[PDB]
DNA sequence: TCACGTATGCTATAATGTGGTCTGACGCGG
DNA sequence: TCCGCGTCAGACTCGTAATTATAGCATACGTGAGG
RNA sequence: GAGUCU
């Protein structure tokens, strides 16, 4: 027995009969007519390819189990898409296409913020220019080195080079054996603090009475313009919706509200105290 | 979440969840497809795999790795052991209004009492200064308040003066190995940077002065400040629980 | 071990006399480091217990 | 035992906390055993008064 | 006898063992590992030549085409240290490898000349390592420790009463290659013998011997000897060698030709093994019943019909002796096993091997290492092949074939990398001796198993995997590849061998922060040996075997020096006259006594050399250059001690000092401290932060001087002469004509490091130690580093401590220090602060650096220029704005109530938010220095203008000086060849020197040397220009930064804290302290005299420690301030050089038989009153470590002084005035300022950030978190009883969201409630659970 | 109905079973 | 008797941020603006 | 990973 998922897919794929030039176009000429028998052996007897070329496409992005998957799924496609009428072999046509499925499924999958093809495309470009450039260069090429090479714009290829940087885990240990991670560092800012939180409730529990304080036509046109009071932030022209239903009158006493509450913060302790706040 | 350069982090959940989608759904797309089942029997075996690395990783297998050579945290590690919920954020956790400095001696304290220098006691009893500078009229708003005691001015230690008579700090030692290893005392605010200890709790604590340093924590609550006066009070805790003999002994 | 040391910390110890004290040395300093957590982990039990 | 009888109170949350977490979630998992917070762990665990 | 440095303040020193072999170079492996590594090797392969010639020349799977290394070279660093440390970089340098691809043809047989391709190419750049041992990585000093592993070779071990119940002592072997598969043989309780490899499964030994072809019939005649068995006429007979019927009963009557020698059930002693033995008897006839049970060694078929009789290894009987005896077999050949002596375990080994044949041995060893897989003939013998037979997947290396043979008891030394048949069998054989009764298993503990692996080794290692890494691309692209087209640069890849020696020189165990607050600390920390890393031990797999001492320590790695960390007995420092083996294992010198005279002709032992030999020890007394006086020598042998004659002594200890380290050299009075605060005080001397002024140790050792000098700290004279040019910034030394090179002028330029940043954020200043114009000697110290006073190293500051307690101020080893020292600012520590401004790039937009912010006070933006960073020199604290730094915000929802109060002011918030770079909270001082880094294509700002305006003016008068000097030296000595000549003095003077290069003389040796001065003058001319070009480029160049990064200022503040209460103090000697109250100058105690102590300590604090040295230390201190108080006196008073002369003659020739002997008639006038001015602070006085100074001296040396043998003198309290009731021990102890100070040990919080998930309080000062409540903290209120105060740390000040920000605001209101809740880390617990299938619900009232 | 980023598609020489650490201990089941 | 699994004291300070490799171009697929 | 108190 062997109890391992992979030497298993393997000891099954073995016992699998190796087609020969007119036993692949006997079978494949009945697999575009359509055939049961035919999709199943050509493929069936085709895996053992599809191994050796995950084997190469290997320590990148996925596994290994995971190439085979996704090579599979090229030599279906290799199978449907056949042309035993061409003199051609099968294992040079399908070589094209588990090459292909498992390099373009691995730009999507490798990555935890999905990169596109365009972009990662884009980006190799870069990097075997890089290659080239850095052994006559000795030291890694710049990122204008790069972009002067290709005379390409170095905004251009700073944004890919930036999109390469790859993403540390939180559960990654700074101390070693068992000390503190980086959850036990970063904050949570978007639940602000005690001190925080009482601020906005002192804040705006002290401007609740200060619109009782003002006048009564003061407070109703200036709370209800900047959304305090109201439902909706109207504008100086949208307060003539309600009763003041004027342009120049709103503004006067909008202002008017403001100015007798810039000298309520004056004497209370704050103006240029809060200026800097 | 977003580290401050660029870069970002993730859970190593995040890693597992996603190799179970990527093989549930290719498995979607191969019983669509009607392959073979030795094709089909592969895919079945790695969503398994995923499944189980998913939930507990090191137990079926050997652990599936991410990009540092180490395992990927399963679900069940966030559970399970020492730094699993339970032992370490939850039967024991990080407290507001706590500090710790070097200690070293107080030998004119008396035994209710211990040396709480001046900065620290001011920003461990903020949220009492704020609430007494409101009282005597002082500040309008907490904004306020705030700046009247970052800029430490001079009627802001007349107040914090006020808040600590009578209002008793714990003091805490490692490792914590009997209850007396906490003790509450009446504050004493002193000019330096350093706690200064009565010298007869010090055999509890079995704290020595070659440079050990206390915790500090502040009973909040009336309760609290009841409770560490009543019952955690060094004076009220003279004879060993272990054996009925005084632990408060000169040496 | 069976050569104990005839010296004292006034007179001085010598060159041997030295290197045999050091192997009493590491080993109370080790129980210091590591026999402490098998002591530890007695407390934790009875803690769980009672 | 002492490492026994912690095991063997009633209530899991007692248990799931000394050690031998992913066993005794299992084995109270399948007995739907309810945990009523009787010692001082449950509710210290809750964040309740002991 | 004495030289210039030393002349300045001579130190007494009590020794008197003659120091036959003086210190060697204390960071010696550093710097040779490591010049292993890059000197490019031609043959002996070292390093990087070993690496290409191992893994190239690499070939494709065709076969046609290959690439073959021909030799590499090393490029100057792009950056220098100076530019590495400043800027940020990684100093390496260029790798550049010769690599050439040769193409067979495929129709010949290998038609070798085809295409002979050829490039240099770059593979990566190897960091170099410093002058000092140190290698900078992005802009870091850093050391790689040396390992300590298990050497490769054969290694014979035992489970005692581990394996198993009855306690059978399992005997077990390790075949341990430097690459490639284990191999382990070992027992069972049933004395099976059984063969691992890998550790893997269980496999019967006998199966690894079939796999190398031996039938059953070779594998009994390997390990059993034979009975030969004949049958005469009826009668059966038996071969006799007597000494195998030893100790053993007579089963039959023994009897010869006509005797019995032995009856039945009676014991054959030695006697009855002589008497046959003398009567030489070789047949015996025996009965028929004795051969039932042995075992028949071959086979034996019947001649008449031609099948098997018995097999060979099966148990005869009488019915096979019958068909045997008719057959016509009349000699029988048998195994001989003895129960006790000679073991059959191969003979039961074979009855379990189930495999037959050699295919069928070499199936089970396939089927075994890859399961599952049907095995072939090919797969079988291939696998075994290359497990430990190929030359590629094994290797022992010279280290363990050594060790291996040496181990197997062989003639020869060097040998193969691969195991032959021979070695497997030889070890199978040494393994049943061993079980057998001769042969005992090795102990791992023992040094001469631990094998010393230095940077170099370690480097090499990662760099084979780099090209490793790069055999798999040249395999793949040689098969794929077009031959025509490729070149061998489009196979190479240079990202692998950079990525995996950066691996090592980086993410490494051994590869970490050079501990860099102290000389003593930087030295240590490359002595040091760790065997923890990869290829080494664990916590986890640490027993306390590993930790303890070992007798072989001795001399190699001192036992007295290792952390009190959980890696107690894993880091060890190195001895001081230690070395690494030729191999690597450890040695120490001895002094080589012949016809009992000893040799100063010194032999390195190593670990396992020094177990035969007899040690003496320093102890014993020569007769000078005769032999041993003393009839009875203590020596040392075979790991123990005991007395020997004189004749036996084979050798003898070189020092006094060598079982000890660097750090425990420098304790004075070892000898007189308990080993476990001997530890502590080696330890805590290196965290000893470096005084504002270098104060030297009165009471030292000596070893001061080798230490400041080996660390490279101290700027020292590479040539001797007079100095030209003296000066805060730099020092000019012209040379003496014998050493002076004759080509260039000879002018030395030692430019200081200046007040700048160490690893610890403390200070680094070089100050110049010789005066304008000063004679300075080859190797003398002509700058003192931050730790060093005249060469001497200077840790810390000598006072006056009195032994008395005083009011519990001195409780528990609490300090009491006068207002007196904080006065003199002496224990004052300066600390350098690096902090770094970044202009990042946002989705939103890149960040500005002005002084123009949104929201600021005409406060902040004060000590702001126009380009918004701080004026050098500006005085800041905790608040005030360094750099300028703007960010951009989207246009953010402002709330209401935010945008009324905007509009109340007008202000309203810009697009770009705010980021500025300002002073750490709590942390304050001067701004020393600011960096500005753009990169290339930036706007700059014109502060960064200003930078470059200062850089280029300084370099272009830099280069400026440096030709100006060289010149003014090269026709100095021109002028002085021109009238060896033609000599034409003050008339050829007159007019200009430009063309003085001209002239020249006849054709002589002296006209070759003009010539030689003017080519060199043009040389430095046009090298003048190429120089100053570097430099200008460098400076214009825009410096290429992380992505995402715009810009960076570096801004370096200046901290200067003095000594608080809380500041951590100790001696030398483990004895710890934290100062508890600085008392004034008035209320301290103060002698008859009138002087007031500096510290009193408390004298609880010794009896406890077992440390005496301290109090030894501080009578001596208390001599050596005795002589120098007296010294000032008399030149205070001024009375005669030739009085200076009698007092000091008398001081320094005090000792009982002194070694170092200054006679004053060799000292000049001019000479002794310079030494006197350094003396007078008190004469510095050396105690090696255990060649000590004695009571009796110390008191002699006290009446010198006019000073009580007591060493106690009355003291009077400050306070009172009246006498304390005794006299008190009072002296100059050599204290140590720790790094532990107390502003940045305090630490508070009252409400602040929360961590992301579990919602709890962050950790740590670095991140301003709160304190942990472990659960053993929980237990202390669970027990008293206070629910509220702990429901209060689990709740409210923890996680509980609502009960946080509710109760922070009842406290503002004043009111003290309690209004909790539910943690968020329950609220985790459950959806945790939840996810993982489990339903966790709660069911309610 | 283009513009733009994103995705799907196909390439016929033959090519057809994979390849990091090597050491803990003391207890307690099945 | 042998293999597997489970435990293994308590707080603090510092410190840093790593690597690789995926061809090249043509029609299809979705949303958003302008005639 | 290098430390500090036990
Ligand atoms: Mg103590
Ligand atoms: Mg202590």
Redesign the interface.
């Known amino acids: 027995?062997?109890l391992?998922?992979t030497?298993?897919?393997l000891?099954?794929?073995?016992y699998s009969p190796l087609l020969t030039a007119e036993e692949e176009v006997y079978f494949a000429r009945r697999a575009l007519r359509g055939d049961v028998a035919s999709r199943?052996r050509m493929?069936?007897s085709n895996?053992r390819l599809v191994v050796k070329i995950a084997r190469?496409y290997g320590n990148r992005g996925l596994?290994l189990?995971?190439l085979?998957?996704?090579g599979?799924?090229g030599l279906?496609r290799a199978v449907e898409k056949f042309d035993p009428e061409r003199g051609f072999r099968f294992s040079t046509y399908a070589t094209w296409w588990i090459r292909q499925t498992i390099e373009r499924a691995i730009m999507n999958?490798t990555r935890?913020?999905r990169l596109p093809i365009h972009i990662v495309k884009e980006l190799n470009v870069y990097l075997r220019t890089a290659?080239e450039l850095?052994?006559?260069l000795?030291?890694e090429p710049?990122?204008?080195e790069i972009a002067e090479q290709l005379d390409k714009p170095?905004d251009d290829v700073?944004r890919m080079?930036?999109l390469n940087?790859?993403?540390?885990?939180?559960?990654?240990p700074l101390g070693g054996?068992?000390e503190?991670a980086?959850?036990?560092?970063?904050?949570?800012?978007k639940?602000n603090?005690?001190?925080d939180?009482?601020?906005?409730?002192?804040?705006?529990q002290?401007?609740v009475k200060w619109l009782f304080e003002l006048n009564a036509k003061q407070r109703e046109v200036?709370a209800r313009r900047?959304?305090?009071l109201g439902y909706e932030?109207a504008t100086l022209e949208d307060v003539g919706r309600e009763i003041g239903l004027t342009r120049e009158r709103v503004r006067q006493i909008q202002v008017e509200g403001?100015r007798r509450?810039?000298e309520i913060?004056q004497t209370?302790?704050?103006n240029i105290?809060?200026?800097?706040? | 979440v977003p580290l401050d350069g660029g870069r970002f982090a993730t859970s190593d959940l995040n890693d597992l969840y996603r190799r179970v989608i990527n093989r549930n759904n290719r498995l979607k797309r191969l019983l669509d497809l009607a392959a073979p089942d030795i094709i089909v029997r592969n895919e079945k075996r790695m969503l398994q795999e995923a499944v189980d690395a998913l939930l507990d990783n090191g137990r079926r297998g050997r652990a599936i790795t991410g990009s540092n050579k180490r395992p990927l945290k399963s679900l069940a590690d966030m559970i399970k052991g020492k730094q699993g919920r339970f032992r370490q954020n939850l039967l024991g956790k990080r407290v507001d209004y706590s500090g710790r400095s070097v200690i070293t001696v107080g030998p004119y304290l008396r035994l209710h009492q211990c040396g709480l220098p001046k900065k620290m006691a001011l920003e461990l009893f903020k949220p009492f200064i704020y609430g007494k500078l409101e009282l005597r009229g002082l500040a309008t708003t907490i904004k306020a308040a705030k700046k009247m005691v970052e800029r430490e001015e001079a009627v802001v230690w007349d107040i914090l003066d006020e808040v600590i008579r009578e209002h008793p700090v714990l003091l805490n030692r490692a490792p914590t190995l009997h209850r007396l290893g906490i003790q509450a005392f009446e504050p004493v605010l002193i000019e330096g940077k350093a706690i200064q200890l009565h010298p007869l709790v010090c055999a509890a604590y079995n704290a020595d002065f070659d440079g050990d340093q206390m915790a500090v924590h502040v009973p909040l609550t009336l309760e609290a400040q009841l409770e560490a006066r009543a019952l955690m009070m060094s004076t009220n805790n003279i004879l060993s629980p272990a054996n009925g003999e005084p632990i408060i002994v000169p040496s | 071990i069976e050569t104990p040391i005839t010296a004292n910390f006034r007179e001085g110890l010598n060159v041997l006399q030295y290197f045999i004290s050091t192997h009493g040395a590491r080993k109370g300093l080790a129980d210091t480091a590591l026999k402490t957590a098998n002591s530890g982990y007695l407390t934790r039990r009875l803690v769980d217990v009672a | 035992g002492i490492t026994k009888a912690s095991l063997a109170t009633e209530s899991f949350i007692s248990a799931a906390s000394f050690q031998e977490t992913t066993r005794v979630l299992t084995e109270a998992a399948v007995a739907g055993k309810r945990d009523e917070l009787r010692g001082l762990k449950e509710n210290v665990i809750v964040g309740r008064l002991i | 006898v004495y030289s210039y440095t030393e002349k300045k303040r001579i130190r007494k020193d009590f020794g008197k063992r003659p120091q036959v072999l003086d210190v060697p170079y204390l960071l010696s492996i550093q710097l040779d590992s490591f010049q292993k590594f890059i000197e490019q090797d031609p043959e002996g392969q070292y390093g990087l030549e070993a690496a290409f010639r191992s893994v190239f020349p690499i070939q494709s799977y065709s076969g046609n085409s290959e690439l073959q290394y021909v030799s590499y070279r090393l490029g100057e660093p792009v950056f220098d240290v100076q530019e590495c440390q400043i800027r940020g970089v990684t100093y390496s340098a260029p790798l550049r490898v010769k690599l050439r691809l040769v193409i067979y043809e495929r129709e010949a047989p290998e038609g070798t000349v085809k295409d002979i391709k050829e490039q240099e190419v770059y593979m990566g750049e190897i960091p170099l390592m410093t002058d000092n041992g140190t290698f900078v990585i992005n802009g870091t000093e850093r050391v790689i420790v040396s390992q300590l592993h298990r050497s490769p070779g054969v290694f014979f071990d035992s489970d005692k009463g581990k394996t198993h119940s009855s306690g059978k002592v399992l005997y077990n072997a390790r075949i341990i290659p430097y690459r490639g598969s284990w191999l382990d043989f070992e027992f069972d309780p049933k004395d099976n013998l059984f063969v691992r490899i890998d550790r893997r499964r269980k496999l019967p030994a006998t199966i690894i011997l079939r796999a190398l072809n031996y039938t059953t019939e070779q594998i009994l005649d390997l390990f059993f000897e034979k009975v030969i068995f004949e049958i005469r006429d009826n009668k059966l007979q038996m071969e006799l060698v007597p000494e195998r019927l030893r100790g053993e009963t007579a089963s039959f009557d023994i009897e010869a030709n006509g005797k019995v020698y032995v009856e039945k059930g009676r014991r054959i002693t030695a006697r009855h093994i002589r008497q046959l033995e003398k009567d030489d008897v070789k047949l015996i006839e025996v009965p028929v019943e004795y051969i039932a049970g042995k075992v028949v060694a071959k086979d034996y078929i019947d001649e008449s019909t031609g099948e098997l009789i018995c097999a060979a290894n099966m148990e005869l009987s009488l019915d096979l002796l019958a068909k045997l005896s008719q057959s016509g077999h009349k000699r029988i050949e048998t195994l001989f096993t003895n129960d006790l002596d000679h073991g059959p375990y191969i003979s039961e080994t074979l009855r379990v091997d189930p495999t037959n044949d050699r295919l069928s041995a070499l199936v089970e060893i396939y089927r075994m290492m890859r399961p599952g897989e049907p095995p072939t003939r090919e797969a079988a013998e291939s696998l075994f092949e290359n497990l430990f037979f190929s030359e590629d997947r094994y290797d022992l290396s010279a280290v363990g074939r050594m060790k291996f043979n040496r181990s197997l008891l062989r003639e020869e030394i060097e040998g193969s990398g691969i195991l032959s048949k021979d070695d497997i069998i030889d070890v199978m054989k040494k393994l049943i001796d061993i079980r057998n009764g001769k042969g005992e298993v090795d102990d791992i503990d023992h040094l001469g198993n631990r094998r010393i692996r230095s940077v170099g080794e370690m480097a090499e290692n990662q760099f084979r995997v780099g090209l490793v890494r790069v055999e798999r691309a040249v395999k793949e692209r040689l098969s794929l590849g077009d031959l025509d087209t490729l070149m061998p640069q489009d196979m190479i890849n240079a990202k692998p061998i950079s990525a995996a020696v950066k691996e090592f020189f980086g993410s490494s165990q051994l590869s970490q922060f050079m501990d860099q607050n102290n000389p003593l600390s930087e030295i240590t920390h490359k002595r040091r040996i760790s065997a923890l890393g990869p290829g080494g031990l664990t916590r986890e797999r640490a027993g306390f075997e590993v930790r303890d001492v070992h007798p072989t320590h001795y001399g190699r790695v001192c036992p007295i020096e290792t952390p009190e960390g959980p890696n107690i007995g894993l880091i060890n420092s190195l001895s001081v006259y230690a070395q690494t083996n030729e191999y690597g294992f450890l040695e120490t010198p001895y002094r080589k006594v012949t016809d009992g005279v000893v040799t100063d002709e010194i032999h390195y032992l190593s670990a396992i050399e020094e177990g035969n030999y007899v040690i003496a020890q320093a102890n014993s007394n020569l007769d000078e250059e005769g032999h041993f006086v003393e009839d009875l020598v203590t020596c040392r042998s075979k790991g123990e001690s005991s007395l020997f004659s004189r004749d036996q002594v084979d050798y003898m200890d070189v020092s006094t000092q060598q079982v000890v380290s660097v750090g425990a050299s420098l304790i004075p009075f070892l000898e007189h401290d308990d080993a476990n605060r001997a530890l502590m005080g080696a330890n805590m001397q290196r965290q000893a932060v470096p005084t504002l002024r270098a104060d030297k140790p009165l009471v030292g050792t000596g070893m001061e001087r080798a230490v400041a000098v080996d660390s490279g700290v101290t700027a020292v004279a590479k040539r001797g002469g007079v100095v030209q040019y003296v000066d805060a910034s730099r020092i000019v030394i012209k040379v003496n004509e014998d050493e002076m090179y004759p080509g260039e002028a000879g002018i030395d330029i030692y430019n200081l490091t200046k007040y700048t940043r160490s690893n610890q954020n403390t200070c680094i200043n070089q100050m110049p130690c010789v005066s304008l114009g000063e004679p300075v000697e080859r190797g003398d110290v002509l700058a003192d580093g931050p730790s060093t006073d005249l060469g001497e190293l200077a840790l810390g500051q000598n006072m006056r401590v009195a032994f008395m307690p005083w009011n519990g101020y001195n409780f528990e080893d609490s300090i009491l220090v006068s207002e007196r020292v904080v006065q003199e600012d002496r224990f004052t520590t300066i600390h350098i602060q690096e902090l770094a401004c970044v202009s990042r790039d946002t989705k939103l937009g890149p960040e500005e650096i002005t002084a123009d912010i949104p929201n600021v006070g005409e406060a902040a933006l004060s000590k702001l220029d126009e380009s918004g960073i701080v004026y050098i020199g500006a005085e800041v604290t905790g608040g005030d704005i360094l750099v300028g730094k703007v960010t951009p915000k989207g246009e953010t929802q402002l709330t209401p109530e935010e945008k009324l109060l905007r509009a109340i002011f007008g202000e309203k918030a810009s697009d770009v938010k705010d980021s500025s770079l300002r002073v750490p909270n709590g942390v304050s001082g001067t701004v020393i220095d600011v960096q500005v880094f753009t990169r290339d294509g930036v706007e700059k700002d014109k502060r960064a203008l200003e930078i470059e305006e200062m850089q280029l003016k300084q370099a272009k008068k830099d280069l400026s000086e440096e030709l100006q000097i060289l010149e003014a030296g090269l026709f100095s000595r021109i002028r002085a060849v021109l009238v060896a000549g033609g000599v034409e003095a003050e008339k050829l003077d007159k007019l200009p020197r430009d063309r003085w290069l001209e002239l020249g003389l006849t054709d002589e040796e002296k006209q070759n040397q003009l010539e030689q001065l003017a080519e060199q003058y043009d040389e430095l001319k046009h090298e003048f220009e190429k120089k100053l070009e570097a430099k200008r480029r460098k400076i214009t160049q825009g410096d290429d930064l992380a992505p995402g990064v715009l810009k960076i200022v570096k801004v370096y503040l200046a901290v200067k804290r003095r000594i608080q209460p809380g500041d951590k103090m100790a001696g030398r000697h483990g004895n710890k302290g934290v100062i508890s109250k600085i008392n004034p100058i008035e209320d301290m105690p103060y002698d008859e005299n009138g002087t007031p102590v500096d510290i009193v300590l408390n004298p609880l604090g010794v009896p406890s420690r077992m440390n005496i040295g301290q109090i030894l230390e501080t009578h001596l201190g208390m001599a050596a301030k005795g002589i120098g108080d007296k010294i000032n006196a008399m030149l205070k008073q001024q009375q005669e050089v030739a009085k200076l002369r009698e007092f000091i003659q008398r001081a320094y020739d005090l000792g009982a038989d002194v070694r170092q002997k200054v006679d004053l008639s060799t000292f000049s006038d001019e000479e002794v009153m310079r030494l006197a001015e350094n003396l007078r602070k008190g004469m510095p006085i050396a105690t090696p470590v255990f060649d000590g100074a004695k009571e009796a001296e110390i008191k002699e040396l006290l009446k010198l002084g006019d000073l009580p043998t007591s060493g106690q003198i009355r003291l009077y309290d400050g306070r009172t005035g009246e006498q304390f009731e005794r006299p008190v021990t009072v002296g100059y102890m050599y204290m140590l300022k720790l790094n532990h100070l107390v502003d940045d040990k305090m630490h508070a919080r009252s409400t602040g950030s929360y961590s992301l998930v579990t919602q709890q309080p962050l950790g740590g000062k670095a991140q301003f978190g709160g304190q942990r409540f472990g659960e053993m903290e929980v237990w202390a209120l669970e027990a008293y009883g206070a629910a509220y105060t702990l429901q209060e740390m689990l709740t409210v000040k923890s996680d509980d969201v609502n009960g946080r920000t509710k109760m922070y605001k009842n406290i503002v209101d004043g009111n003290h409630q309690m209004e909790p809740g539910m943690p968020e880390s329950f609220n985790v617990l459950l959806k945790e659970i939840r996810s993982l299938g489990i339903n966790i619900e709660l069911e309610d009232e």
């Open positions: 027995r062997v391992d998922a030497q298993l897919y000891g099954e794929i073995g199943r493929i069936e895996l190469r596994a189990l995971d085979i998957e996704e599979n799924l279906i999958q935890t913020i290659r850095s052994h006559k000795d030291h710049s990122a204008e170095v700073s080079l930036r940087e790859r993403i540390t885990s939180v559960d990654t054996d068992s503190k980086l959850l036990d560092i970063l904050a949570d800012e639940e603090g005690p001190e939180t009482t601020q906005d409730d002192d804040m705006k002290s401007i200036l900047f959304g305090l932030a403001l509450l810039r913060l209370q302790g704050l105290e809060a200026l800097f706040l």
